[PDB]
Amino acid sequence: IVMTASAAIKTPQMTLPIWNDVSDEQADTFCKSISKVLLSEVIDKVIVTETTGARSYVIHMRFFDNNEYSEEYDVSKEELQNVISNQFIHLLEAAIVKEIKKQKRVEANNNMNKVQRDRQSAIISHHRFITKYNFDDESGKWCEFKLELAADTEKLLMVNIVEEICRKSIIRQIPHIDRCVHPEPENGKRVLVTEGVNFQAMWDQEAFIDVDGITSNDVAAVLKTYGVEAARNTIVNEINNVFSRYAISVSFRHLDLIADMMTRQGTYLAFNRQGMETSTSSFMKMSYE
Amino acid sequence: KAQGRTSGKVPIPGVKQALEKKEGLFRKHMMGKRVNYAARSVISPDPNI
Amino acid sequence: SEIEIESVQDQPSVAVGSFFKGFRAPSDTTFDLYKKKEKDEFVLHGENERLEYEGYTDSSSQASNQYVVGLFNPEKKSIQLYKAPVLVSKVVSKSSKNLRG
Amino acid sequence: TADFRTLERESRFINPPKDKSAFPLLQEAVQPHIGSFNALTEGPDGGLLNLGVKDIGEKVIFDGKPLNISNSGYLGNKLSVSVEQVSIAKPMSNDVERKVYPSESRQRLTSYRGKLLLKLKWSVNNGEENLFEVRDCGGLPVMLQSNRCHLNKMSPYELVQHKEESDEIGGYFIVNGIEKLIRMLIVQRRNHPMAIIRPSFANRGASYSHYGIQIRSVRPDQTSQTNVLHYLNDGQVTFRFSWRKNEYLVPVVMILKALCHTSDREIFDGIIGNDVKDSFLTDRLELLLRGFKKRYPHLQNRTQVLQYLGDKFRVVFQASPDQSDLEVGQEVLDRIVLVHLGKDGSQDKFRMLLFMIRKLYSLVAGECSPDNPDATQHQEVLLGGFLYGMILKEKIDEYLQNIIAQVRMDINRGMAINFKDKRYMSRVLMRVNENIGSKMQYFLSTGNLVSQSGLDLQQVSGYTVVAEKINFYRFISHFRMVHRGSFFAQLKTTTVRKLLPESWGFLCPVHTPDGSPCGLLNHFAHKCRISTQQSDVSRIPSILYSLGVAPASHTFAAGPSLCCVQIDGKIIGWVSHEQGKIIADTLRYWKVEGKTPGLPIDLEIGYVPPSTRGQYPGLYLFGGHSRMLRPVRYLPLDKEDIVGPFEQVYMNIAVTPQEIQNNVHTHVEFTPTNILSILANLTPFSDFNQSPRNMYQCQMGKQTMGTPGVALCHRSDNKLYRLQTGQTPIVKANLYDDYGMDNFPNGFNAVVAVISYTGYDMDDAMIINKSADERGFGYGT
Amino acid sequence: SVVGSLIFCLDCGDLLENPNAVLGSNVECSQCKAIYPKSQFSNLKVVTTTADDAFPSSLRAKKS
Amino acid sequence: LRLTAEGNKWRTDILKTSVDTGREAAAEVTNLDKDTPADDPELLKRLQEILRDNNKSGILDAVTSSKVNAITSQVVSKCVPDGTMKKFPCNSMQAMALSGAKGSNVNVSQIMCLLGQQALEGRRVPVMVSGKTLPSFKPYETDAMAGGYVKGRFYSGIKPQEYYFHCMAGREGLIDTAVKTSRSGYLQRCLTKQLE
Amino acid sequence: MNRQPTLHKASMMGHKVRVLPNEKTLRLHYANTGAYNADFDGDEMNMHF
Amino acid sequence: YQRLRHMVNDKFQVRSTGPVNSLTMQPVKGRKRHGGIRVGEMERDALIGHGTSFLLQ
Amino acid sequence: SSRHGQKGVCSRKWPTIDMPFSETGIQPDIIINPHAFPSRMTIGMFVESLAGKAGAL
Amino acid sequence: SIPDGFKKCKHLKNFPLNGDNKQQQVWLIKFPSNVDISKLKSLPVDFESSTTMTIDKHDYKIMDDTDNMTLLVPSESKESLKIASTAPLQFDKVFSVSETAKIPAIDYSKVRVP
Amino acid sequence: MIVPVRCFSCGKVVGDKWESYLNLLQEDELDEGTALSRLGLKRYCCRRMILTHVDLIEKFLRYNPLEKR
RNA sequence: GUACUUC
Ligand SMILES: [Zn+2]
Ligand SMILES: [Zn+2]
């Protein structure tokens, strides 16, 4: 906070006060709706038989139980079907072609229905590699899709090129937040700490969160969104908590001196030579560094 | 700027790198001077003071 | 299941080779067996239309353990002891003899 | 009832024993040092110097004189110069040559140095004639009580006649009258592939992953060059060298196929081939061989790979001009890549190196835990004297390159008559500087080594320490130092400073300085011995291969399914894993029993289970040099066993004969006090004081004003301390008597008064009765 | 022989080139010319499986 | 320092019912809550993976150390100042400590009743790649005594394994003591020049 | 009076002087060393004037 | 009791008018040359912490 | 200091005239504050003093 | 004619090998150098490895293996080697005899003292 | 080194009772305890002076620069 | 310059 010219932080946290009408039995729906879940968390088993006869790649994507991975994350076949179409296959193109450029430097199912035939040709409209795409609509325990390539890309790895996309794909990405947690209330003050910093998308949930009490840890977002002194009176609580932890006592007057001096010129100061660059006396910059 | 010389046991500081002993020579003299009229020894506890 | 022994020899005539797995083995060319005389150190040699057989037999660790071989039929159920060297092969070709001046 | 004696130890003062010296464990403390420098001369092949100079090679040079297109193609006759025998006899100095003494040499203020001599196997036109010539190269300093100094077979009584201690420890150098001891160092395990995860492999390489496996081979002359193999994200591996200031990322096939007649699937057969179910090895190996058939399809056989190696490495090793690529290629291979197996070792060297590649697949697949660069599982201590021999191996070739550059300096200016004359040989020889004693004295007196070739370790400073003679405790510890390395002082994270419970029994956990050097330099234990000479094996493969182990050429398997047995450097092979569990203690019974002539007792055998992400399975043997040992009481046929570092990790032991239980305990230590060092096992009731108070004491234990030794009238140390009223402690461990500490009194008794009566004492101070000081309380000079 | 995705030559003991990188129906060994292949090789088949360790999730921790 | 013969019987009494708690702690985190020793391969396939990383060890040392700390907290709450031979005020060492003069009550707990559990920084004694904590006992360790927590005091001696754990935890304080002062000085010099 | 490593306003302060012609070691009070955060196990201290 | 190596008359630092350097005209480092105590970065500021100005000068 | 880890310097050489005397008649040569033990935890210097006392008897 | 050593083979022995379509199979085992190559009369065999032997030293353990290695068959003398084949010809059960010395055991009564 | 006269704690002469103590061990076979008692040392402050002496000066004199060997 | 030590 003092030296590093506070930027993207090791752990962005935000405390959210909750109303008196909402209950802990209701907060779990919001922790499962805001928490970000990568595409890897819905995969159970991956086997691929790389046949050749004209490269061919059939991908079998075993899933978990329908009630298991749907109720656990509140994600259903609708969100999972559109995400794979709009994100997984497109990132499958930008990743395989990326490696191509540097390269030269239980019966499953049958009898697909017409609704998935037009849905199959929809992918072929905006994709050129995949030739077949099947999915389990009634139970959702697997996801098989067939690919066809030419001999110009004969040899290449299969698991390591897909696992990246399994971690890069997104099912729903609330900005700058990956997961929300519900800590036990202290001093009767029920709160909700999320692992991120985002105020714009958070202001649209006043039905269950008070916007007058939401506090944050990042000092740049509270500056860009709330103001200068709004960043002052929240970093004061930051270095107050980091000192109240070890039960040591210190007066708030010095903590206000460091607070105001750190934000004395418009936005922020870093107390380093990059922050001392804006000064009047030259010997300050000469003697320091 | 100077020669990628063979292992020299150190290059020779002309002015600037000589004006920074531990990168900050201003600390050697300008910020702290060798104090005259000073003493240094071990201490001992004493009551009746 | 106890069983007896009938044949025990001292001179070698059979051998087993360790080159690789699943060889075509046209089996139409003559190959040589070279002996010595320590003890039990033998080598081999062979040629073909595009193949040359260069082999040895455990130039470092052979004098401590040995191989024996036998056979059994649906009536005998016994094994006749027969000494057998363990050949290790290195199939080579001829694309050598080039150098820079 | 630890009865202390007065008549017996007074009799040892009255007259030293005419027979062998008493308290032999005190002499066994510098056994690492004494045996180190003794090894390079004692034993077969005239020691280590005579075998290393043998493995130096023949260097030739040519003149511009014509022969008499092809006649002009031959540039002329060649001078072949090479050394084959170098020896040091004894330090002599006269006006017949008389004998000099080291204690007399310390008052003489000169360095106690022997006399070096070398013979030159100089030849012409590939040995048409040989001209023998023997000359000296200066005086090399020798330590005390060694194969060269006159204090080797000297009787402990007549040690007093030569003006030194009656129990002289020795093993330290004498340079410019002051004593300096070559500091111990700790390095990587020799002849063992190590899997390690370090992100530094991604900084200097593009698209290179964080995995890595390195092996540290070692020549018979105990030198070493590291063999590192990384893991690339593209699908390949990378081998690199370590030259003067050069590193070359040589691929796997250029360093593997160039060994012997291995151009076949057998490169894949050495890798896991017991089953072909998993394809993570198929895509991996296919990318290696496809990449081999991609950049140069005209390269297929063991000859052209060595012509290409010689072509690329023609100017880096100065192998020129008559040495063709057929000789330079084998030169860079026999001298760099896994040099331990030596010449003619290419029959198993490709099996071990390719198996080292196999474990790289085992590491990146995620079933083998990476080793630690600080744990004592794969860390060996260099004896210091071995570093002296290694320096002599690289510094014996500096004047050889000098005379080579000299005989081709005269060919530039011409006027170089035919070298067939003894006069011309002496003329070109007297111009160069061949004095090496002034350079060995430079390394010792300064501390840092100026290595033209470049050793294997990283730091190029901090190799020797001064002997200030402040007490006997810090001397018996200085001879047992284990310094981690000044390169780690620059490193920030404290993962190495924190202990690791494998230090049990080897290095003391509490004997460690405070402050910045805390956790880095921690001395040895009480009765831990260092093997400084390799046991002549000559039959261990002849008995292991008889116990049921398959041949190294008949196995053609890999993977954790088999138990890979690794003797030092060469691998006998691998067999079914359950045979490793019977042999695990069978070869322990043949080890502890004395009827086996082909198995020494000091043969460490560490067995490893194959389950739960353990280190690569099999069975590891040892017993070379630079190792660490400690005795352990063996219960079956109860006798004294001996084990090493890789033993304590997997198999269990017990510390007291009450913790012994049935069927999962096999070894116990008959003395639970040997865990501590000499200083830590010296303090009474070490199990009652707090650990920060015993580490905070270890410095004071070896920073006393004790009696350094009875040599005052004949020493020449700059600063010296001494006390006179030193008394023996009544409450003392038996080790205080076992090491003859009665000869060196360190402290004295005083009546205690636990009281706040004085007031002046404030929770950290002390009081001394004035009358005691008037009577000589702790008097010193 | 033919194992996995590779077809090794054994009359000279090496690995021949890609049956698709060069003109099909005829492949040649580098060190010596041989009449390859038999034009009846296979329809290539191979299967790879994820190590099941690069998927850090909560429900997999529940499966313990 | 000596306590009554009526006192030490409480020490061995409570320390008898603590030999099973060590196993019950690992039994609580292994999802196999009841009735088995270290014999079942089912529970053998649980903590051999709990030692593969840091977080899985961070979820067992929390319940283990806290429960064992509650075991040693009952001793220090019952024995002193009840089972001691000489007590307040005539007890010199005890009265001096609790009177704020020097030390504290946690300092006399180690010398009077129980030293404690040798805990690293949010951690405990590490485990080898071999899966064993320390070669003094059999592999596949499940116990609080051999798992870092000590049983002996600084009055009647200790066990060498617990002294080794106390030795390793003894240095980790000195290591932090060497880096603690090193990191502090930069905060003063960097902030002063700006705030002069 | 000053003592390294000085870290606060109370680490450096001015004291009165009272000589004693009997010893060689410097002196200090009990309640005084609490501000300096020092001990008497060999801790030396700088005496300015 | 083990008497130690530490200071008996080993520190003994005192200087009123000692020889100064030439490149900087300051007291020479090391007391053997009759040196003087040096104030560092942690003491220069701590001197002005009391607000006593003319002492920093 | 001893070999148990209790450092310290002498504060004043108290004469025998003011040294506390035992029932025997001897005056102890040293004085150790009992207030460092609750923090140094050097019980070894106590139990060893029992052994040293019995050894001296 | 490599190497320059002793000589080439001159004698050969007949091998009864029918190659039947109930089976007549070949038999390969392992054994060390210090053995009873000629003085041995009987060697009991069994199923998967749980057995022993009884000779002078009396420390033996027959070990079987299930999971290349082609044996030549010199049915006559002129070329001195042929190929073993019926339709090469693999081998099913490779054995290996180990010298597993008996483990001294069960004695924890003298080292156990109060 | 040399026998410390004027015992530190008590102040009784000690330098006289060393050869007599050695004679009590040579020609009398008496053990430590009753030897220090018969020798005339009652207080443990004086017992710890004779019983603890090292007698190291005899090892110091084994190097005579004023005499051949 | 390199090494060593003091809270
Ligand atoms: Zn071919
Ligand atoms: Zn006395």
Side-chain angles (χ1 to χ4, degrees), chain D residues 4 7 9-10 13-14 16 157 160-161 163-166 710 713-714 722 724 726-728 730 742 749-751 775-776, chain K residues 1 6-11 18 21-22 25-26 32 44 48-49 51-56 58-60 62-63 65 69:
Chain D
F4 82 105
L7 166 63
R9 64 178 182 90
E10 182 69 23
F13 293 154
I14 294 298
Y157 173 83
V160 190
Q161 300 179 355
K163 306 172 176 183
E164 73 259 10
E165 308 291 340
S166 306
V710 186
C713 200
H714 308 293
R722 194 261 293 271
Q724 309 166 12
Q727 299 178 356
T728 172
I730 278 79
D742 299 323
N749 301 327
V751 182
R775 298 165 182 173
Chain K
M1 183 184 64
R6 190 64 64 180
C7 171
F8 308 141
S9 301
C10 64
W18 180 254
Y21 172 79
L22 292 180
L25 271 62
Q26 300 314 106
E32 308 291 338
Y44 58 92
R48 67 98 189 266
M49 196 58 62
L51 186 139
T52 320
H53 184 51
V54 183
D55 195 349
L56 198 274
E58 197 276 344
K59 192 183 187 64
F60 272 151
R62 291 304 302 267
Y63 303 90
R69 303 296 89 179

Side-chain angles (χ1 to χ4, degrees), chain C residues 50, chain E residues 9 12 29 31-32 34 36:
Chain C
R50 296 178 295 101
Chain E
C9 165
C12 55
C29 203
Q31 60 279 13
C32 61
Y36 287 147

Side-chain angles (χ1 to χ4, degrees), chain D residues 478-715:
Chain D
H478 269 182
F479 302 145
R480 306 291 296 182
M481 285 281 298
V482 180
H483 187 73
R484 191 63 185 91
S486 181
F487 179 79
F488 292 90
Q490 181 65 240
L491 182 131
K492 178 178 179 59
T493 174
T494 62
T495 178
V496 58
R497 299 176 178 269
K498 183 180 79 282
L499 305 91
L500 198 143
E502 193 193 7
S503 161
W504 178 276
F506 301 139
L507 54 160
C508 187
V510 58
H511 187 85
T512 291
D514 56 336
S516 34
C518 181
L520 298 182
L521 59 99
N522 37 14
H523 303 61
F524 279 114
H526 168 221
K527 197 185 269 74
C528 50
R529 192 260 298 181
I530 290 178
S531 179
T532 173
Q533 52 92 19
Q534 61 175 358
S535 179
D536 51 334
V537 165
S538 69
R539 272 200 292 109
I540 298 174
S542 300
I543 56 104
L544 257 76
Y545 180 54
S546 73
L547 256 292
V549 179
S553 60
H554 188 275
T555 167
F556 56 84
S561 178
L562 294 316
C563 51
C564 179
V565 180
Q566 303 88 356
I567 320 193
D568 53 337
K570 33 85 177 183
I571 289 86
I572 303 304
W574 38 95
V575 79
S576 195
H577 208 286
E578 74 281 3
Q579 316 185 20
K581 94 182 295 182
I582 282 90
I583 289 180
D585 55 332
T586 301
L587 286 188
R588 288 282 192 178
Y589 188 71
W590 295 74
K591 164 195 179 70
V592 65
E593 226 286 347
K595 78 179 182 61
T596 306
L599 284 177
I601 183 60
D602 53 338
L603 198 158
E604 177 186 6
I605 169 173
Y607 188 71
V608 48
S611 60
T612 315
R613 201 184 291 270
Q615 198 174 1
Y616 201 94
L619 187 146
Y620 292 88
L621 300 182
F622 204 47
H625 299 85
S626 171
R627 49 199 309 260
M628 306 166 60
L629 292 315
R630 64 95 54 97
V632 51
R633 194 69 177 178
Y634 188 60
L635 287 314
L637 208 287
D638 184 29
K639 283 188 300 179
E640 294 186 1
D641 198 88
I642 180 78
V643 293
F646 197 71
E647 180 268 340
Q648 299 172 349
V649 278
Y650 298 106
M651 54 183 298
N652 49 10
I653 55 179
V655 77
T656 172
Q658 287 75 26
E659 194 62 32
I660 304 180
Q661 56 81 74
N662 192 18
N663 298 127
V664 303
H665 269 75
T666 315
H667 294 63
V668 301
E669 40 262 15
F670 57 92
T671 167
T673 68
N674 70 341
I675 316 166
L676 292 318
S677 69
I678 168 63
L679 270 302
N681 211 342
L682 200 276
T683 175
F685 299 91
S686 178
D687 57 334
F688 285 92
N689 299 122
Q690 199 181 358
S691 175
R693 285 304 169 183
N694 293 326
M695 294 177 296
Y696 196 56
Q697 169 55 226
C698 166
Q699 294 301 102
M700 303 306 106
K702 61 177 181 299
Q703 201 62 34
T704 81
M705 202 172 292
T707 60
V710 186
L712 169 64
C713 200
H714 308 293
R715 291 186 65 89

Side-chain angles (χ1 to χ4, degrees), chain C residues 50 93, chain E residues 8-16 28-36:
Chain C
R50 296 178 295 101
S93 180
Chain E
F8 294 89
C9 165
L10 300 180
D11 292 331
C12 55
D14 278 315
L15 177 64
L16 52 96
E28 65 283 0
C29 203
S30 299
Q31 60 279 13
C32 61
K33 195 271 304 300
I35 172 63
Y36 287 147

